[PDB]
Amino acid sequence: AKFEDKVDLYDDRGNLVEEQVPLEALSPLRNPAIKSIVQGIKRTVAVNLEGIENALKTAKVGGPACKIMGRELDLDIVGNAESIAAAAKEMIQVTEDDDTNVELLGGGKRALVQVPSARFDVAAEYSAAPLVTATAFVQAIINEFDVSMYDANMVKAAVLGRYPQSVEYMGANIATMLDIPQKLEGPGYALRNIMVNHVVAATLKNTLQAAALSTILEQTAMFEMGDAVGAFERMHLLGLAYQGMNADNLVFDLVKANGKEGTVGSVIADLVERALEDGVIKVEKELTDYKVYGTDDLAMWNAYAAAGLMAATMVNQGAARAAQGVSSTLLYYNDLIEFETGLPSVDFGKVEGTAVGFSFFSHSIYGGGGPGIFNGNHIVTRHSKGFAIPCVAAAMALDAGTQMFSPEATSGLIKEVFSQVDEFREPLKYVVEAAAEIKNEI
Amino acid sequence: ALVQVPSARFDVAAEYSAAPLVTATAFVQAIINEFDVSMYDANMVKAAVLGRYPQS
Amino acid sequence: AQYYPGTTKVAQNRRNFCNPEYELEKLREISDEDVVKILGHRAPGEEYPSVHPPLEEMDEPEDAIREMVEPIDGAKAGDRVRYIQFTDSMYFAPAQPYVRSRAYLCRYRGADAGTLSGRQIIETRERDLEKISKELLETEFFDPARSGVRGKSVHGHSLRLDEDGMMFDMLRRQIYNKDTGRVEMVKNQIGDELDEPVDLGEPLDEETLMEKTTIYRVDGEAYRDDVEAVEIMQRIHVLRSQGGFNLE
Amino acid sequence: DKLFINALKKKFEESPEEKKTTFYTLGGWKQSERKTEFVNAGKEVAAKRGIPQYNPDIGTPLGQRVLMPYQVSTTDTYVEGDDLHFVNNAAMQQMWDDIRRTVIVGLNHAHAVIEKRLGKEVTPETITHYLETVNHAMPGAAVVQEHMVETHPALVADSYVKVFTGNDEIADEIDPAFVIDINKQFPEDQAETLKAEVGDGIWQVVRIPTIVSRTCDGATTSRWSAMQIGMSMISAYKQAAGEAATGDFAYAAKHAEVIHMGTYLPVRRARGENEPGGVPFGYLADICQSSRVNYEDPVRVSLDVVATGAMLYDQIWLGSYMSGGVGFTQYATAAYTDNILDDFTYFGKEYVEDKYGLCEAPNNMDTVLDVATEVTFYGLEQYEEYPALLEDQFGGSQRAAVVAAAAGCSTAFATGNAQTGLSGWYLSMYLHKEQHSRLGFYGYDLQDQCGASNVFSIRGDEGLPLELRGPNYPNYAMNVGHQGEYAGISQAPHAARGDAFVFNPLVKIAFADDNLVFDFTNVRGEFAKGALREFEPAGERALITPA
Amino acid sequence: DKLFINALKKKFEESPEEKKTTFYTLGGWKQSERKTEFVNAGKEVAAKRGIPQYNPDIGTPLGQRVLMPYQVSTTDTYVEGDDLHFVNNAAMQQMWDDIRRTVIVGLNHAHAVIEKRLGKEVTPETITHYLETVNHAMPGAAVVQEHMVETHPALVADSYVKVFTGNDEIADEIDPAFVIDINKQFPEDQAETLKAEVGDGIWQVVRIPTIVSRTCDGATTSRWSAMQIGMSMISAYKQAAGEAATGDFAYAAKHAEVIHMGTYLPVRRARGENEPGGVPFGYLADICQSSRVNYEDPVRVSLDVVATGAMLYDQIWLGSYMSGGVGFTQYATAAYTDNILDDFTYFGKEYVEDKYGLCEAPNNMDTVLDVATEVTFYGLEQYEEYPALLEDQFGGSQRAAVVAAAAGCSTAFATGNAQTGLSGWYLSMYLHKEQHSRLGFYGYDLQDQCGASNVFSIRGDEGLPLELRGPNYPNYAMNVGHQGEYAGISQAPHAARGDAFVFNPLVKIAFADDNLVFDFTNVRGEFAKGALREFEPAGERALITPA
């Protein structure tokens, strides 16, 4: 291992799972579960057969309020989903014994489609899962009913939308958690252009699991972006471990100590207290009735601070059961702790900066929206390198129904299909088990 | 310098930009460390390697 | 907790506003109906409108965090999220926008605090907002002349005062009575006329304003004279800079 | 006789069947009043600025042949080609500005936020108050803050917001000044279709100022619209001027229920929303309002769309956005002047109805071979029978687009399906290329050689109903003489069917408005009016200039 | 006295130091000549179009306080803030049009194709002939084909092509009408630097017509330029009109030796080239021509760049392209009116000059802590000592941008390095926020809290010298009160050093051109002239519209 840190791994309940695990057992570069989650995210597609059938029945294809009168086709797609799904699987798969998965849901209304990994070993990116799935189901539908050459193009429009006139699959009746590569704010951002609501949908509103999946996706993107390389690698792993994986039970314990009566300020005071006890910080000098704290390990202070930030979101937005205040917590947890200690806030102010504009663009006329529509690829929330969005995911998870644009409104298809994948639903359980199983191979 | 970024980074990556991005920051950091380039001048090493990104 | 550095009265007042163990001075008594009237989200005695069903009528997912974080009463009831917003004159109002937000999240649970140059806001569950509002209105958070409750048209924090020492208000929600020396709130925060105005008490004396204010000014206590407070801000700037480079 | 005979006889001294004439003795550019104006203007320009500009002695000497007048089809107006250059034609520029500066924005999500999140009531009275507020705010005026500085109302007088809904009773409770009345703008059968498509939905048609659209880009429109919608929602519904719920309105207005005229473009032709390349052919047909005033002549409806599209897609988009310079005036004019395309297309319509009856032909390849071959042979024979016609449309590309448009539209008249019409378009090209051993310019039939195979393909970036295709469809992204004709073929089967719209009913209604500056019910008449310098555009700065 | 005292006295009755005034008794909007004009215009506009528009009774009543006049800095012109709205100010619109319609295109690759691939000679004689051909062709006129319809020369009189070269001999050989003479437009030391940067290279400055730029978009510019370059190369150098080599010229003109004003933008803010978001801060500093006329006053040079950038980036780009409506005229005016930023910056220059001497300070954090703290405290103290000044710049964001700009520019004056100047900018915000317990609007210091850490970062989308940053730098992509000030800080160190350019010498030379419509040597004077409605823009359609 490159680094000497070890961490104690805890479950969502707050129970010790494995003691003294090398930090890099949690690294996306080494952890087999993270590799599995990331590859799953790349290759999974939800197909809305009911939607495809209704689009064809009405010729409502190609985007909102769009319809071509006279193109209507009455095909019983949902009635023949099994035959259609089986025919499509034969085209999607590379061999009979590979990891292709095609599973019908909702009595044939939706279909979870997992494209084989082999296809991606020889692909540049991830557009293979949506494109191969789309054409496979288009051909299966056409063959199922012997749709004529003259009408088949409507089946294509019903499945994939206005592409390629539009750059996106505008009006498509398939869904992925990744968006198209052209929409990346920068190279290596693909794992960041995953809406918070998609994560909350997949984790079925589980606070700690939503935090973990989001942290997993964000920090893995930091590796693909090159941010977690060289001098900064340890900072990002410690942030992944302590903020997203509940390492040493710090997030869990902080929430336990402040859940009944606590506030952002009380969580800060206990975190600062814990850091002193664990030797992470020490009094560097004293001013008039004020103590300036220092540290010989900024990366570790930042991770401790990242843990408290998560705990404060859970305490603050948890007490409100309303996600909107997470933009406030991300800001003033960091503002307060800096003047509490004299040490820089999480991500050296990047989280505070993201919170400033995040607050603005979730309470103003100019753009953004509710917390659930943001993501790491959003111009508003791309600035902190993994330390902010997982808190937004935890907050939306704690939301009891105060948001008009909730995961049910913008990610219903994700909520039905992606949540069926065990690794996506409970990533923390899989990543921790994988970490333990490689603890002595690192 | 010919650089081949390890296959392992791409098994856990969505696409292919890790190759230029991991290489760029690695060589940027190595140059800075080789000559102890100062905090005040290091940003020029970054421009020399990767250009006007991310304004462009 | 230290909250904030510095050796001026301002620094101490900033510390006091954040410290939950500091008892904010109660300067006036406001009726519950007057708070509901000032807020303007519902009529006094009107039922709390619900944004979603009660939490006990819902079956929340088994979630260790949900079980450990006690919801505020308004969230249990399913109350809407409403707001109260204050403008603070730069001429020595006791509370200022950053001071408020920092203090709110030290003192109050489930708070969504927003800070701006001419307005500071908190959003939370309606019934809980009303009790927060009572304290924000009754204590040294508020002065009837140098502070104003404004849901819109907040212009005034940076404007000169009028002949009476009142802060400018495009909508004149708070009226100074020159015959009595007291301030009355003729309209609600959004600017809708009230049937019965709300007595807001006498403005604080210029000497008391400087005693309680949290803004630094050359004609009060200058920030540049609070050398230890400036030093911590410079320290934070330097450490932030070094952390972002991290290749020394 | 033939609809183009009048135009040809006014263009030349000789009869239209005479295969010989005399050249070189016309005086060059001196034969033309417009070239004379240009030469004198060029002299004044160079003198004033100190740099040579327009100079007839540069390059080759124009006017060794007759520099022709052009009849704008369906009019009796005759102008020189320069008058139909988009730079010289304010009607053409305003047509694009009126599209570029328009966006459709729902109020349904917004009204749900108002009632569910804020707990306030939405009524026709609250909507009217909101609409009066947004019509103050949308041109650039303030409603909340003190010391706001605002746009000059007379410079932004063309900016406003209207609404429409399929619910007649709701519509009648809203102040009619703000309502696009579907019953008043559309014939009964079409109005019933459109109102049934919209149902209880309420949709805003927002038009931002032309002066802003010209100062900025098309991607400005939906943002500008959203800011002033947002401010008017704050004002009319008395929410905090910037609270959490305000964000829901911004997301609704900018994303959740916004309908752009055009989608953004990929990086090689990088462009934001509401640029010509993002406007699919089906939208273009629906923006053109011929359908609701000429619905008993499917040829007229289809060719009004062709004129709309040929001008926009070829002269402004491909001829400037994607290239520039002299540009592609004549490429586009061949499709809306001299009644040539009208003659060819009226022949096909009569052929289809005599043989099949409109829409009654089988939708298969048999109909494609029949109709497209017959109409192609008719069109090409006119060029052989009339030398004046062949000299008028001298560019092979011009003739290909006109002949194939008549063949394609006629095939769609027969089948009622735009996709078989598109197949007929490509067959027309193949027959044309073999008949005359020529077709268009060096790269004209890139899409045409790809054409046949991609008409009915279903693959990723190949398969798409014609109505959904547009200037960004891969094969179509580069070349003149196609896009405007494709929009016509998109309209053709729906015009024969009597359909109220081609692809989007909200887009159709959004331009059935009398408050537009350009009259989309009479595109070609507007082009003629612009040519004569009788069109008054919006967005001029005369009010803020010394003279 | 303070440079802003004059504006304060002409704005309010009280002396600038007075702490009390009276409100509510001014008559609302009736106090203002401009608001009265707007009210009457809205009445005429609403009546004429049949839809309510500007109405002072909508929303809250403006003018409970004094609606202030603004002095344009470095002028004696006083106008109401509405006259500095870009929609109401033709000078501001023309400034952006002159940038948007400009592209720089080398002739070096082209001349190599001519001699190496075609085997023809290039000489000053052929270059002049080509330049006479291209100035006929570039506005939209023909040089090769018969029967071409062209643009009206008077509508496109602002379009032309010039060249410059560092080789004085070659420059003298070319007809001076087509030459930007570096020796005549720059002082001796700057001219020598610029000529050494360009060497024997020959570069065209192409400006396409304003009327086209307003009809289309910024990505049109380099394409339009390339078409007419290509047509003029065919003509002047007698190649086949469309052979293999013709493609080499198009590739070189559209990609190989083209310099855009702005690079394209990513999808969320999808935009083509030559839009404001793509113009890096260093280019904007170099587009501004103050450096070559005010080079003995580094404050004046730096703040003319601030005015250039504040208007373009905040009012047109962020206030319209990226939002719209009333917009942010005041957010930008704070940086170029009432001589307020000038007072703060001249103080910092003087403070740096007394303590270090310009450019003699160590380039480290010690200098940042010293200069940015001192200047920040000076600026904020003025707002405390003068109540009028605080009421003048009533928005916290306005004060933040002005104070930090002076602090940043001052620090760069000391170090000669823009990156430490940027560090000072952020230090000023942290002190400002703590002094007054407020800073800007809801999301003003997103980039400012990221600021310190990202000034010296080297990571992928974090590290960049300030000159290379621009409106698309991630932290900077959203918010007013920064971008134009950043262009000033970018200029700050170069102005102190006497540098002829900040970031690109070709961009610097390309706007040292007396045939531009907007005079970039006196940006703020031009804004004042537009405010008075004395500026005559290009691109008007009056010639082709009725009287």
Ligand code: F43
């Ligand atoms: C120089 C090129 C190569 C190229 O890339 N484009 C050219 C020229 C370009 C220039 C000519 C402007 C000028 O004269 O200065 C412009 C106007 C584009 C521009 N730069 O603004 C144009 N052609 Ni061309 N170009 C046209 C056409 C044509 C037709 C002309 C055939 C004939 O017999 O006259 C042929 C292609 C073909 O044979 O199919 C053609 C080729 C050519 N075209 C050959 C020159 C041919 C020659 O030496 O005469 N164009 C047309 O076919 C009609 C429309 C016409 C366009 C102007 C308008 O639309 O009004 C113009 C479209």
Ligand code: F43
């Ligand atoms: C409604 C919002 C929420 C939002 O997203 N933008 C608003 C309003 C928006 C609107 C106001 C137009 C109108 O009045 O109808 C416009 C003009 C943008 C637009 N849509 O055209 C604008 N603000 Ni605002 N906005 C401004 C500002 C401000 C300052 C005003 C502080 C004060 O004391 O007056 C504060 C932020 C702060 O406190 O720091 C502010 C907030 C707010 N601003 C609050 C309304 C506050 C209120 O109730 O009065 N703006 C400024 O700080 C100065 C520049 C000014 C902008 C207009 C210009 O640049 O000329 C305008 C920029």
Ligand SMILES: C[C@@H](OP(=O)(O)O)[C@H](NC(=O)CCCCCCS)C(=O)O
């Ligand atoms: C955030 C983003 O909005 P969306 O969340 O994508 O709707 C973005 N707007 C902006 O950045 C607005 C900037 C100008 C208005 C605020 C200036 S402080 C845009 O439209 O692309």
Ligand SMILES: O=S(=O)(O)CCS
């Ligand atoms: O001559 S080409 O066929 O290249 C096209 C002329 S527009």
Ligand SMILES: O=S(=O)(O)CCS
């Ligand atoms: O109140 S907000 O800061 O959102 C508006 C700033 S223009």
Ligand SMILES: [Cl-]
């Ligand atoms: Cl678990």
Ligand SMILES: [K+]
């Ligand atoms: K830290």
Ligand SMILES: [K+]
């Ligand atoms: K008003």
Ligand SMILES: [K+]
């Ligand atoms: K010519």
Ligand SMILES: [K+]
């Ligand atoms: K434009």
Ligand SMILES: [Mg+2]
């Ligand atoms: Mg080690």
Ligand SMILES: [Mg+2]
């Ligand atoms: Mg569990």
Ligand SMILES: [Mg+2]
């Ligand atoms: Mg404790």
Ligand SMILES: [Mg+2]
């Ligand atoms: Mg070093």
Ligand SMILES: [Mg+2]
């Ligand atoms: Mg005749």
Ligand SMILES: [Mg+2]
């Ligand atoms: Mg015959």
